[PDB]
Swiss-Prot record, chain B:
<keyword id="KW-1278">Translocase</keyword>
<keyword id="KW-0406">Ion transport</keyword>
<dbReference type="InterPro" id="IPR023366">
    <property type="entry name" value="ATP_synth_asu-like_sf"/>
</dbReference>
<dbReference type="InterPro" id="IPR004100">
    <property type="entry name" value="ATPase_F1/V1/A1_a/bsu_N"/>
</dbReference>
<dbReference type="InterPro" id="IPR022878">
    <property type="entry name" value="V-ATPase_asu"/>
</dbReference>
<comment type="function">
    <text>Catalytic subunit of the peripheral V1 complex of vacuolar ATPase. V-ATPase vacuolar ATPase is responsible for acidifying a variety of intracellular compartments in eukaryotic cells.</text>
</comment>
<dbReference type="InterPro" id="IPR024034">
    <property type="entry name" value="ATPase_F1/V1_b/a_C"/>
</dbReference>
<dbReference type="Pfam" id="PF22919">
    <property type="entry name" value="ATP-synt_VA_C"/>
</dbReference>
<dbReference type="Pfam" id="PF00006">
    <property type="entry name" value="ATP-synt_ab"/>
</dbReference>
Curated annotation (Swiss-Prot), chain C:
<comment type="similarity">
    <text>Belongs to the V-ATPase E subunit family.</text>
</comment>
<dbReference type="GO" id="GO:0046961">
    <property type="term" value="F:proton-transporting ATPase activity, rotational mechanism"/>
</dbReference>
<protein>
    <recommendedName>
        <fullName>V-type proton ATPase subunit E</fullName>
    </recommendedName>
</protein>
<keyword id="KW-0406">Ion transport</keyword>
<dbReference type="GO" id="GO:0033178">
    <property type="term" value="C:proton-transporting two-sector ATPase complex, catalytic domain"/>
</dbReference>
<comment type="function">
    <text>Subunit of the peripheral V1 complex of vacuolar ATPase essential for assembly or catalytic function. V-ATPase is responsible for acidifying a variety of intracellular compartments in eukaryotic cells.</text>
</comment>
<keyword id="KW-0813">Transport</keyword>
<keyword id="KW-0375">Hydrogen ion transport</keyword>
<comment type="subunit">
    <text>V-ATPase is a heteromultimeric enzyme composed of a peripheral catalytic V1 complex (components A to H) attached to an integral membrane V0 proton pore complex (components: a, c, c', c'' and d).</text>
</comment>
């Protein structure tokens, strides 16, 4: 029973590690896509704030 | 007008003041923080800021106002919660959706748009009126009418009085002409926080407080307009005594000004008192929020706000006493207030005194307490009202050598000294009957005589019994009860019965929630009569033994009376005085049957 | 067995923490890419030669008004030094117009290298005790710091 | 809002005494403006403006003052108060004293900057602590209980296992309502702030939190003893700001463990002494009460939000007393006091919690028939009375001899023995259900006859005296 339990635990740990890796890859892809989408607007806003002086 | 120079903590030195008088409130910075002057050195003047000082600049403008610290009075002052500088807290929470209190909020102390009903008191045109005369009555809420009076510094002939109807504080309800010039008056009345309200003459109090708790109302009484001091204890004290003085007291209204205390406790009080359906009227269950007022200022509040909170609280007491009600103000502060004085004095670089407290602490505490006392009011009609100051002292962890404690006891007339040892033993009213005192025991002679012409003697006998027991406790701690004689044994039995029956009270049950004076005096008379009869019996010595043998005889063959005596505390007050009085008279008759039936067969 | 399963749970938690830390580090890396792109755009802004002079005049006016000192000593890059030398007394006239004060006795010499400057001026006061760093690279990393919460709010997905 | 201004940079450091650098010839100096100091070596420290006076301004430095020179030390006025960045990612990370991440990870990407010493809560918007949290320790559960939004400081002395019991509470804290309570929002999201802690204690807390599987939940701000002293006067404020953002603006129940508040009083003493201010009791600053109120009154449930903040600031008495100014003021402000006694430790009981000095003001609210057994208050009030009277009896028997004691005296002594041994003691990893704790308490009580049980009412006696 103990050997079966440890084998099942190792399999579950491997499955959880694979799921975590897949979720991490998905998250990185989403963040990269959002950054690529919004980068130009962000830089434009930043430059607009930098390149203005009052009085 | 003026500009900031120095910003250290809550102490701000602003140059360019020149003609800025002491305590003349000034407004600091763009955020417009309130602030009072504390010192001058020439063109510059020290200011206390009453608020967080983070973010003040140099040369940030400071505006003068020429007015000392003033609280706005009038209708609606009852049943509200005010900051130390008298900001309506609920108004701030509703008007601004933010749950926080924003820095430098400017909200009127009283709403200036609510419609109030006006009932003039038959004042005719061309009549003569004077300071404090009571020209109109306004029903702020049911079961609590609010009389409207002219300010003490006003007089003149009544050229125009507004008719009855709905009015707002922005309207002029009365006009007066004096010394060739006319002045107007609205329902508002601004008054400096210090400089107590004028009184025609003070008076010597005669009515007792008759609070709910049996120990306070019987052993160590306080008079209406009196002066008390409890050591601000928790579980007991600041909660049970506050509840008794608020919902179970004969004072016509309550003003809770406890500042410098825990926020959770303040929230609990402010959430429990809204329901608080005390039967203040004869047959009505109106909530006491139509009767009380909070000036809550938590511990995290700015240090300079403690004195402002205390003085606004006592000023509000004065407005009500002037109308005629017997207000009773309870201050959970004055333990944090001394700390506030130490903070400001040290920051102002003042030379400290004994134990580091400022030398003028006694003067400030006197100038606060001496505003108590029942007073014959100003103006017409003749009237009378009182203010009670049940303050707080350091908890029973420090001896009376504490400067705040010594200063209070040098002025306070009644000391309800709670002892921490009783709190450990879970005796909940927790008043130590050896160290407490009440200098009002002489003025209450008339009331005690008229209520029951034999209460003074039984009270003195109870005091003697308690003192004798406390005296021989040391001897028992050495030798033990082996040498105790009949008199000593019966004295200790009666003392134990008095301690556990009379001096205790649960206050969380109808048995001890509120003990009327008649029930308490009947318990005292029953216990003292039992003690006297038992002492006489053991002194008789019949049957060749008497003495402790007779004591065991009455504790065994007559112990049902003893059990009924120790259970007499459970007489439900809801049954009414004609029922409880009959029950106690029957118990007294049965007790008289004992010690005579016990003497029938000569023990 | 109990401690084996406890250690397995601890290892799973550590793996989860590592994954979330990797995600957060990638987020910070994207933020760094944003900052690099903003720096590149700021450097590209220096290519202009007409509105650039107006911006330099505005910057020098702002700095001189913030110091409000009797004698500043402006320092500008060797590149575009001609623009500063041209604007010259226009800033002094504008400042004297701002408030009834005599025109500052500005002084303009050593210049920091272009990439270090990337436009903007350093004004300071006599003896260099008080320094105002209005460089474009200095205006950035302050706008960035302030607007970073807005950046995260923009990075919903 | 329209256009910005780059922060001024100065060099007029005319005075450096202790942790204070005294600038001069400065203009427009804000109060509590956070400054950035760049030394001659190029390292950057961060400081705060304690006082502004005329053109001068006194600046304390967090990272110490070991390299400042009147010539090269540049100081820069950011023109703003401290603003710790906060985000939901701040969970499950460990930080330095001033908020710099030490988990080898990236700096926090902020959702917003919230100024330290957050906005005061109008008392008309607070609510009394309603629900009770199960502390696991039986002595706390039966007497001196803890409700959500409470401020219970554990009073301890040097050497006592206050850190161990704090870790036990962190591992065991949970809801109690009808024993019913995923609960991710119900997860307490503990925020641990350590000031002036021996590195062994920090390693212990780190390992305990890692082992208990809470590493994805807890958050650690550490100010070790070797770390600069001044950061100890900022770390708890940072922790409380983070807790406020995690609870009120995010709807998570939050628990806070401030460690060694005496190590904060020491920082207050150092700062006050360095400024030549008027001292108070034992030389502590006269405004220590105000600072302690500011650091404690930032916990409690709020009506408009589903969150809550419940803090357990542990405290170390200097010479194992209470009259010392710091524990005294803490007792004045906080709504509770848990006492760990040297006598119990000398007798080798792992929880040395002396149940007699203990107190919780909000105890009467957490308990009740709606969430606890109806006899809870009676049971507690009786055990307390019997323990106190039995202690008096034991003191008397210490001089009159064991023979002079009466039958009631012997009953009280046996009650004391079984109370201090079977009841107070508990496993370092074993909890006790509140109903199980009440059952144990009833077993302890039933030693005495029904007559001696004066506090317990007969109605509760009938349902419980036999069981």
């Amino acid at each position: 029973e103990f050997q079966r339990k440890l084998a099942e635990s190792s399999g579950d740990s491997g499955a959880n590690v694979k799921r975590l890796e897949q979720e991490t890859e998905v998250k990185i892809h989403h963040l990269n896509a959002g950054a690529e989408k919004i980068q130009y607007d962000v830089v434009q806003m930043l430059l607009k704030h930098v390149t203005t002086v009052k009085n | 007008y003026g500009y900031v120079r120095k910003v250290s903590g809550p102490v701000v030195i602003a140059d360019g003041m020149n003609g800025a008088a002491m305590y003349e409130l000034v407004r600091v910075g763009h955020d417009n923080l309130i602030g009072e002057i504390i010192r001058l050195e020439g063109d510059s003047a020290t200011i206390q800021v009453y608020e967080e000082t983070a973010g003040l600049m140099v040369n940030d403008p400071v505006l003068r106002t020429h007015k000392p610290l003033s609280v706005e009075l009038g209708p609606g002052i009852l049943g509200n919660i005010f900051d130390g500088i008298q900001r309506p807290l609920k108004t701030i929470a509703i008007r601004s959706g933010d749950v926080y209190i924003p820095r430098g909020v400017s909200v009127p102390a009283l709403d200036k748009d609510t419609l109030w009903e006006f009932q003039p008191k038959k004042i005719g045109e061309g009549d003569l009126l004077t300071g404090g005369d009571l020209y109109a009555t306004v029903f702020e809420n049911s079961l609590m009418q609010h009389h409207v009076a002219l300010p003490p510094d006003a007089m003149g002939k009544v050229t125009y009085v507004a008719p009855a109807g709905q009015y707002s504080l922005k309207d002029t309800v009365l006009e007066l002409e004096f010394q060739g010039v006319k002045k107007s008056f609205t329902m508002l009345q601004a008054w400096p926080v210090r400089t107590p309200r004028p009184v025609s003459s003070k008076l010597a109090a005669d009515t007792p407080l008759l609070t709910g708790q049996r120990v306070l109302d019987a052993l160590f009484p306080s008079v209406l307009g009196g002066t008390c001091a409890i050591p601000g204890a928790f579980g007991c004290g600041k909660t049970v005594i506050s509840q008794a003085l608020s919902k179970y007291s004969n004072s016509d209204t309550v003003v809770y000004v406890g500042c410098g205390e825990r926020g959770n406790e303040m929230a609990e009080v402010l959430m429990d008192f809204p329901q608080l359906t005390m039967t203040l009227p004869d047959g009505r269950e109106e909530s006491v929020m139509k009767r009380t007022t909070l000036v809550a200022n938590t511990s995290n509040m700015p240090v300079a706000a403690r004195e402002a909170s205390i003085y606004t609280g006592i000023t509000i007491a004065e407005y009500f006493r002037d109308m005629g009600y017997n207000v009773s103000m309870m201050a959970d502060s004055t333990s944090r207030w001394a700390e506030a004085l130490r903070e400001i004095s040290g920051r102002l670089a003042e030379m400290p005194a004994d134990s580091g407290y400022p030398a003028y602490l006694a003067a400030r505490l006197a100038s606060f307490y001496e505003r108590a006392g029942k007073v014959k009011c100003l103006g017409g009609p003749e009237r009378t009202g009182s203010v009670t100051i049940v303050g707080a002292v350091s908890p029973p962890g420090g001896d009376f050598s504490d400067p705040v404690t010594s200063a209070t006891l040098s002025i306070v007339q009644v000391f309800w000294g709670l002892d921490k040892k009783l709190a450990q033993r879970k005796h909940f009213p927790s008043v130590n009957w050896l160290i407490s005192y009440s200098k009002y025991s002489t003025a209450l002679e008339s009331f005690y005589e008229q209520f029951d012409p034999d209460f003074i003697n039984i009270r003195t006998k109870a005091r003697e019994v308690l003192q004798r027991e406390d005296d021989l406790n040391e001897i028992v701690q050495l030798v033990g009860k082996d040498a105790l004689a009949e008199g000593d044994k019966i004295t200790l039995e009666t003392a134990k019965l008095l301690r556990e029956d009379y001096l205790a009270q649960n206050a969380f049950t109808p048995y001890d929630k509120f003990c009327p004076f008649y029930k308490s005096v009947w318990m005292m008379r029953n216990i003292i009569h039992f003690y006297n009869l038992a002492n006489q019996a053991v002194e008789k010595g019949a049957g060749m033994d008497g003495q402790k043998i007779t004591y065991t005889l009455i504790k065994h063959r007559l112990g049902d009376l003893f059990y009924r005596l120790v259970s007499q505390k459970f007489e439900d007050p809801a049954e009414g005085e004609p029922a409880l009085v009959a029950k106690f008279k029957k118990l007294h008759e049965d007790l008289t049957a004992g010690f005579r039936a016990l003497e029938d067969e000569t023990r | 067995e109990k401690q084996v399963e406890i250690r397995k749970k601890i290892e799973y938690s550590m793996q989860l923490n590592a994954s979330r830390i990797k995600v957060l580090q990638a987020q910070d890396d994207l933020v760094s890419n944003m900052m690099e792109a903003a720096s590149k755009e700021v450097l590209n802004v220096s290519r202009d030669h007409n509105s650039y002079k107006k911006l330099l005049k505005g910057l020098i006016v702002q700095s001189l008004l913030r110091l409000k000192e009797p004698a500043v000593l402006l320092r500008c890059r060797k590149d575009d030094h001609h623009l500063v030398e041209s604007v010259l007394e226009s800033a002094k006239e504008e400042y004297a117009q701002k408030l009834q004060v005599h025109p500052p006795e500005i002084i303009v010499h050593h210049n920091a290298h272009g990439p270090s400057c990337s436009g903007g001026v350093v004004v300071a006061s006599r003896d260099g005790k008080i320094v105002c760093e209005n460089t474009l690279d200095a205006r950035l990393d302050v706008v960035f710091r302030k607007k970073l919460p807005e950046i995260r709010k923009q990075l919903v997905s | 809002e329209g256009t910005l201004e780059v922060a001024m940079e100065y060099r007029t450091v005319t005075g450096v005494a202790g942790p204070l650098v005294i600038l001069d010839k400065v203009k427009g100096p804000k109060y509590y403006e956070i400054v950035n100091i760049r030394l001659g070596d190029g390292t950057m420290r961060r400081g705060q403006v304690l006082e502004v006076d005329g053109e001068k301004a006194v600046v304390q430095v967090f990272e110490g003052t070991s390299g400042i020179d009147n010539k090269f030390t540049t100081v820069q006025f950011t023109g703003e108060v401290l603003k710790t960045p906060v985000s939901l990612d701040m969970l499950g990370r460990i930080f330095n004293g001033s908020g710099k991440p030490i988990d080898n990870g990236p700096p926090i990407l902020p959702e917003a900057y919230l100024d330290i010493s957050g906005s005061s809560i109008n008392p008309s918007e607070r609510t009394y602590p309603e629900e009770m949290i199960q502390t696991g320790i039986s002595t706390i559960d039966v007497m001196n209980s803890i409700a959500r939004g409470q401020k219970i400081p554990l009073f301890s002395a040097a050497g006592l296992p206050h850190n161990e019991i704090a870790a036990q509470i962190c591992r065991q804290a949970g809801l109690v309502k009808r024993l019913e309570k995923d609960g991710e929002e119900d997860n307490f999201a503990i925020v641990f702030a350590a000031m002036g802690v021996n590195m062994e204690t920090a390693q212990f807390f780190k390992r305990d939190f890692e082992e208990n599987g809470s590493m994805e939940r807890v958050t650690l701000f550490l100010n070790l003893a070797n770390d600069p002293t001044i950061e100890r006067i900022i770390t708890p404020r940072i922790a409380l700001t983070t807790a406020e953002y995690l609870a009120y603006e995010c709807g998570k129940h939050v628990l806070v463990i401030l460690t060694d508040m005496s190590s904060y009083a020491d920082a207050l003493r150092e700062v006050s002494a360095a400024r030549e201010e008027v001292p108070g009791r034992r030389g502590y600053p006269g405004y220590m009460y105000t600072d302690l109120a500011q650091i404690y009154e930032r916990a409690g449930r709020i009506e408009g939000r589903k969150g809550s903040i419940t803090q357990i600031p542990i405290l170390t008495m200097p010479n194992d007393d209470i009259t010392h100014p710091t524990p005294d003021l803490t007792g004045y402000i906080t709504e509770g006091q848990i006492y760990i006694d040297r006598q119990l430790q000398n007798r080798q009981i792992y929880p040395p919690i002396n149940v007699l000095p203990s107190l919780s003001r909000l105890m009467k609210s957490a308990i009740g028939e709606g969430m606890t057994r109806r006899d809870h208050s009676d049971v507690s009030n009786q055990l307390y009375a019997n323990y106190a009277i039995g202690k008096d009896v034991q003191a008397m028997k210490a001089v009159v001899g064991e023979e002079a004691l009466s039958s009631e005296d012997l009953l009280y002594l046996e009650f004391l023995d079984k109370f201090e041994r079977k009841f107070v003691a508990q496993g370092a990893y074993d909890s006790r259900n509140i109903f199980q704790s009440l059952d144990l308490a009833w077993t302890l009580l039933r030693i005495f006859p029904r007559e001696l049980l004066h506090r317990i009412p007969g109605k509760t006696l009938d349902q419980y005296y036999s069981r």
